[PDB]
Structures are given as C-alpha cells and as structure tokens.
Amino acid sequence: MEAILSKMKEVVENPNAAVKKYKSETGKKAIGCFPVYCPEEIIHAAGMLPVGIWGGQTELDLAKQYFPAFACSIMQSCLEYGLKGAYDELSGVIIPGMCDTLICLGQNWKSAVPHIKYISLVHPQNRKLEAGVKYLISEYKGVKRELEEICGYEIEEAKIHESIEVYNEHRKTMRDFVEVAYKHSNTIKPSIRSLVIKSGFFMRKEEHTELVKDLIAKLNAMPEEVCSGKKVLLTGILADSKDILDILEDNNISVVADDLAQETRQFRTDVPAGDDALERLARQWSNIEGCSLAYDPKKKRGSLIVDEVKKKDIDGVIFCMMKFCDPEEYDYPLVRKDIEDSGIPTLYVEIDQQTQNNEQARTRIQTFAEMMSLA
Amino acid sequence: EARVVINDLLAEQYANAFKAKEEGRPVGWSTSVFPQELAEVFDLNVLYPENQAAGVAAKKGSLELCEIAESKGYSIDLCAYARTNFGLLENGGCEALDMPAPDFLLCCNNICNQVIKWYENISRELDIPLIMIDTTFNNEDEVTQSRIDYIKAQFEEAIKQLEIISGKKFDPKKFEEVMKISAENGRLWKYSMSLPADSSPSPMNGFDLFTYMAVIVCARGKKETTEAFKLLIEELEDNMKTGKSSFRGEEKYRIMMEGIPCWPYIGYKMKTLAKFGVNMTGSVYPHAWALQYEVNDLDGMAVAYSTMFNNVNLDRMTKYRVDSLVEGKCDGAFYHMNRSCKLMSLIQYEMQRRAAEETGLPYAGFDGDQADPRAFTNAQFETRIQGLVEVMEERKKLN
Ligand SMILES: CC(C)C[C@@H](O)C(=O)O
Ligand code: SF4
Ligand code: SF4
Ligand SMILES: [S]
C-alpha cells in the first residue's frame, strides 16, 4: 500500500499544486466547497473539480479587521487564507448559510475578496415537508445558473444523473473501507485512517474510488487483527491535525468509527432514485440524520452513536469540540447523557487551529486510556 | 401615567398565564419576532423567554441561573438569554420574576439561528410540540418568490398544529380582526419612538425605548396595547411644547447607540451619559416591529417577517444605520460589542467603517453583554465615552 499512501500524502500536503495540475491537463476550472454540505454532483457534471475547504493551522492577522476574537477557530482560518490570497486559483466558492457564522462570512467576503465569486445557498430547516423539498430545488437551480455563468456552457440533465451514480458508488466504497479498517486495527493507525478519507477532497471521486478499492484488496489479503490497545469513536466537526493524532497513537488508542463532519457524515447517506435530477439531490437532505446542523427536535444523534459502539465493542467516545462552535456546544449535554446512561465512558477535548500549547490534552488523554484499561 | 399603565399591562400578562396553567389551559413560549397573529386567533396564552431574562437581569438575579446551566455542561460561549433560560427550567423557576413551564413552543429564525438549537433542546427534554417558521437569509436585494411560497406553506402547517393543541377551529372572520389590530399597533410603535428625531431637545431619555419595547413584543395583536400607545403619544407631544422630558442633565450631544443595553448595569449607564450631557436621539429599533402589510394579504405578511433588519444583506443593514444618524441630527455613534450576539458582532467592524465614511461623523465603542454581568467593566465604559465627548466638543468649538 506504500505507493498508494504516498500518492494520497502528496495532494493533501500540497493542494494548490494539485489544482493547477487539473487546470493544465483538462482545461477546465475548479470550485471551492465550504464545510459540511454542498451539492458536489452539479459541479462534477460540468467537468469541473469540487475542492473541499476546511481551514488549517495558521496564526491570525488580516482577519482581525473583520472578526472579533470569539468567532469559531475554523472560520477564522478560512478568512485569513482568503485574504492572504491562498484560494486565488479557484473560479468561485459555495458558502452555505448553515449557521450565524457562515452567514456573516459570506457577507464580508463580498467586499473583502471581490475577485472570487460567492455563490449563495441556504438549506431549509423544515426539510421533511413537501414544501421544503420544493424550495431546495429552487435554491439548487440558482446554483446551477451561476455555475453556467462561470464556465460558459450548459450543464445537461443527463450528466447530473451520471455524476449521481458515480457519487453513490464512492459512498458505498468508503463504507467498505470503514469495515476493513475495523478488522485490521493494529496496521491502520489514526494518522493513516484520516489520510485515506481526507484525500477524497482533492481529486475527482472516480479516481479516489479506484485507489481505495486497491487498498481494500491488499488489506483483505492479510489476516484479521486482534486489537492490542483500546478502541474509540470520535464525534464533532473535525480532527485532522498531526498533533492530536500522534498523541492518540502514543497511548496505543485505535480509531475504528466516527461521527465527524469532515469524515463519515459525508458518506453515511446515499442519494435516492428518481427521474428529476435536482429532485433526487433535494430528497437526500430530507434523509440525513444524526448531525448538529440538520434540524431534529428528537435529537437521534445519541442513539445512533450507541448502536454503533455496541456493534464494534468500542471502549469509549471522545468529543472533539471545535473552539467557539455554538451548534456543537448546544448539543453536548443531551448527547453525552444518552451515551453515559448506556454505560459508555466519554472524554472532552478542545480543538483549536491557532493552538500554541497542548500539554492539557496530553495529560487528559493519558488518564482516559489508562481508565479504559482497568475496565 | 403612561409609565405605570404600560408596567401594569405587562404584569397582567404574567398573572393571566399562571391562572391559565392552574386550570387546564395550555401555555406557550415564543421568540421575539414570531408571527404572533397565528396564536392570537385561538386566544392562546403566550410568553417570551427573551423578555423574562432581561427582566431578571435588571434585578441582578441572572448570574445565578447562568451558573446553573454552566454546571450542567452548557458553555459560556452561548447566548446569555439561552443560559439564563436553561437555568430557570432546571431550578424549577425563580423569585425575582417567575413564570410557568410551557406546553408548546413557537420558533422563528429571523432574529438569529441560535434560537433553533435552543428550542430543539427544550422540545426534546420536556416532550412538547415545536412550531417552526423558517425565514432563510436574504442575500439578494428582494425576497425571492421561492421564499414567499415556502413561508406561506409554513403558515399552513402552523395552523394545523395549533388546532390540535387548542382543540378549536380556524376562524377567517377572526383572522381579519386580529390583522387590523396588529396593523395599527405596528404604526403607533414606529411613530412614537421616532419622535426624538425631529425635536431639539428630545421629549424623552433614549433608554426609555427599551422599557416600552416589552409591550410591542408580548401583546402586538391586542386592543389594550392600542389604547396604551395613544396615551404615551399624548404625553410626549405635550413635552415637545413645554420643554419637558425624562432626561436629566442638559442635552448637549445627540448620538445613535448600536445594540441593546447591558441590563445588570443600566442604572450606572443612564447616570453616566447624562453626566456628560449625552442623549440618544437616533435609533433603528422603531423599524423592528412596525411589520407593515395590506390587511388580508398573505404574500405581504410573509415578506414583512422575512425582511426584519436582522435578516437582510450587509448593504441594507448599513443603510439603516446611515439614515438614523442623519435623520436624528446626530453628532456621533457609540457601539456595543455584545459577547452574546454573534450575528450582530461579526459584521460590526465593516458596518462601522462604512457609516463613518458616508456621514463624516465620529465614533467609538465598548465591550459588554445584555444579561451576563461578567462581560462589562465600568472603568472601560467611562474612558471610552469621555474620549468621544472630547472629540464632539472640539468639533462645535469650530462651528
Ligand atoms: C434585534 C432584536 C429584536 C434582538 C433583541 O430582542 C434581543 O434578542 O434582545
Ligand atoms: S460555528 Fe460551528 S458549525 Fe458554524 S461554521 Fe463554525 S464550526 Fe462550523
Ligand atoms: S441576543 Fe442575539 S443571539 Fe441571543 S437570541 Fe437575541 S438575536 Fe439571538
Ligand atoms: S463547519
């Protein structure tokens, strides 16, 4: 798998080079997609490249002219990069209005980064009402219209259906990797598990698919493994920094499942059958479950996490809490209770892209790991 | 007079709700810019968590509730109105301003998206019906036809839920009457609170607007509100003729203040501004609850709730502040950076640059919170206002 892992690392550590390469070879453009949910199938159908945008480790400077200190870490990073010019190879960006902070970012962007077209999109809360489906279809028609303004040609209905089968294929394959990885927990460390998944944001899905199938084939040709340490499930926005993942490994902790927005939330739910392309996409949003950004007065998130912990005999759950994220903060008390009431232990860890020090997380995680042991 | 009339009318709403609860009548909790017309048609009792939290905060009892919610696991980063409310439920009430638990919920996100998560939590923990009216943010200058159709359909769903909760049928004749009441009160709110703009000096202390506000929030569709605002108007107009007003101190400088007041300290703030001769005569809030539409027009009603100034693009937001400064004949602007409100805080820097450019006027600001006392510091407030006063005075020293 060495050749495959080297390929993945390359694009993840040098995304700008990968984007220019796609433009030179294909002669087509690239569009950025901001966190949680965008309709990638539409960009894909035009022959364009959908690039994921998830912040990064940076100090703040230019952003201080637009945000005060209490905006969430990830969005502080995204704005700084934007103002510094790091996204200039892109022909536009979709910034969905999922929360107060994403809404305010789009509005500042309009006057702060004039040269990169901002495409608006707001998902409905009443997502299960037939009237809500209709509204989202109109929102997606807007997105299609503005993508055509950019590229200079029509995006055909037949092609959107085609890109949808492609994306469902990729979702099925990632779910296959999740199971195999769980069966080879000693070989697949937290750093490798993250790389395999995250690399899917920086290439065409059809390419990523062939790569993961290869690795799956290589892994099944190896004996199943008896975990030598402790098993965990991670939940929250994201956990991709080298720092936090090395600490996990230092305590011989293995990640065998997740409820992270950057990871399994993306491929957990498929797009349904239909004759109308945009209708199929809209009904996907109706179907999503177990996420802090998807309206649900019953809060099924806790229950879904318990079911999965039981299936895989997992030893604990770690809340990876994005600094100053209000939706995740609102969820925390009720979700934690459903998990602990079932008998499963939990840990709190702050995620900060501007960190500086990490001795706190270090001591805390060591205690958790020891405790899981004596249990 | 009007002062006492308005205060007595508020306490009456609370007393009516308790009486409703001890019998078999259902009571609701609602966000401050929800389509109240839909519940008044059923003669339902309805209360407002935002009003309660500001009220207990002014009596210095909010910190205790916040700390109860924080010990349950809720982060201090969350809105102070939300934490105060979480503590109230856990504590089983409070004594400085009590209110009964609800049997149903009414949520509209025109003011912000935090109320969505807040009300999700309440619905789950208490097992009660949540009524949701989703007004998605306007990026375009005009409300899209798709938004109009979506809201109207959501009006229908809300009515079906309310027939079940209340056990009564929707009455078209009665819907018309309520629409007429609401339309007159909207216009009386806008007229009365705009009077400071064209009067030198103003007939009232600017802070007074935030006491009157509670009435237009909790009883917008009621006849008693009509009669109360007519009384208030008579009084202000006479002040305009006699040179009287609730403002103590000489009105030397006229300003616009951005943001809602820090309730745990409002007493210190009033005395401090008057000390320096400062009074607020330009405001955006007269436009918050006007909510104008043509009677019997569903499309017009949808557009009105959609376009409350928290839910429109940054260009439009900016225009509101520009017009209030020029119309009020103001000498400067003073900004509240409110730790609770991300929606207002995360566009403040750009909005304040633009306004100063268009009008040529001086500005300054301070840090605080509407309900949590840990966020405000007297000394800072003092130094900041003094600095703005020195600049405004150097100006007229030239004129
Ligand atoms: C913009 C205002 C209506 C918000 C205000 O009521 C509050 O939430 O305190
Ligand atoms: S506040 Fe939370 S959900 Fe919103 S943009 Fe930030 S991390 Fe994402
Ligand atoms: S203070 Fe701001 S965040 Fe809190 S409820 Fe009001 S509008 Fe929403
Ligand atoms: S996010």
UniProtKB/Swiss-Prot annotation, chain A:
It catalyses: (R)-2-hydroxy-4-methylpentanoyl-CoA = 4-methylpent-2-enoyl-CoA + H2O. GO terms for biological process: L-leucine metabolic process. Its EC number is 4.2.1.157. Pfam families: HGD-D. It is an enzyme of class 4 (lyase). Binds 1 [4Fe-4S] cluster. [4Fe-4S] cluster binds at C72, C99, C325. Transmembrane segments: none annotated. Its cofactor is [4Fe-4S] cluster. One of its GO terms (molecular function) is metal ion binding. Keywords: 4Fe-4S, Iron, Iron-sulfur, Lyase, Metal-binding, Plasmid. Activated by HadI. Belongs to the FldB/FldC dehydratase alpha/beta subunit family. Involved in the reductive branch of L-leucine fermentation. Catalyzes the irreversible beta/alpha-elimination of water from (R)-2-hydroxyisocaproyl-CoA to yield isocaprenoyl-CoA. This beta/alpha-dehydration depends on the reductive formation of ketyl radicals on the substrate generated by injection of a single electron from the ATP-dependent activator protein HadI. The enzyme is specific for the R-isomer. Part of the heterodimeric complex HadBC composed of (R)-2-hydroxyisocaproyl-CoA dehydratase alpha (HadB) and beta (HadC) subunit. This is (R)-2-hydroxyisocaproyl-CoA dehydratase beta subunit. It comes from Clostridioides difficile.
Swiss-Prot record, chain B:
Activated by HadI. Keywords: 4Fe-4S, Iron, Iron-sulfur, Lyase, Metal-binding, Plasmid. It catalyses: (R)-2-hydroxy-4-methylpentanoyl-CoA = 4-methylpent-2-enoyl-CoA + H2O. Binds 1 [4Fe-4S] cluster. Pfam families: HGD-D. Its EC number is 4.2.1.157. The keyword Metal-binding applies. Substrate binds at E50. Gene3D superfamilies: 3.40.50.11890, 3.40.50.11900. GO terms for molecular function: 4 iron, 4 sulfur cluster binding; hydro-lyase activity; metal ion binding. It is an enzyme of class 4 (lyase). Its cofactor is [4Fe-4S] cluster. One of its GO terms (biological process) is L-leucine metabolic process. It comes from the Bacteria. InterPro entries: FldB/FldC_alpha/beta (IPR010327). [4Fe-4S] cluster binds at C79, C112, C341. Involved in the reductive branch of L-leucine fermentation. Catalyzes the irreversible beta/alpha-elimination of water from (R)-2-hydroxyisocaproyl-CoA to yield isocaprenoyl-CoA. This beta/alpha-dehydration depends on the reductive formation of ketyl radicals on the substrate generated by injection of a single electron from the ATP-dependent activator protein HadI. The enzyme is specific for the R-isomer. Belongs to the FldB/FldC dehydratase alpha/beta subunit family. PANTHER family: 2-HYDROXYGLUTARYL-COA DEHYDRATASE, D-COMPONENT-RELATED (PTHR30548), SUBUNIT OF OXYGEN-SENSITIVE 2-HYDROXYISOCAPROYL-COA DEHYDRATASE (PTHR30548:SF4). Part of the heterodimeric complex HadBC composed of (R)-2-hydroxyisocaproyl-CoA dehydratase alpha (HadB) and beta (HadC) subunit. This is (R)-2-hydroxyisocaproyl-CoA dehydratase alpha subunit.
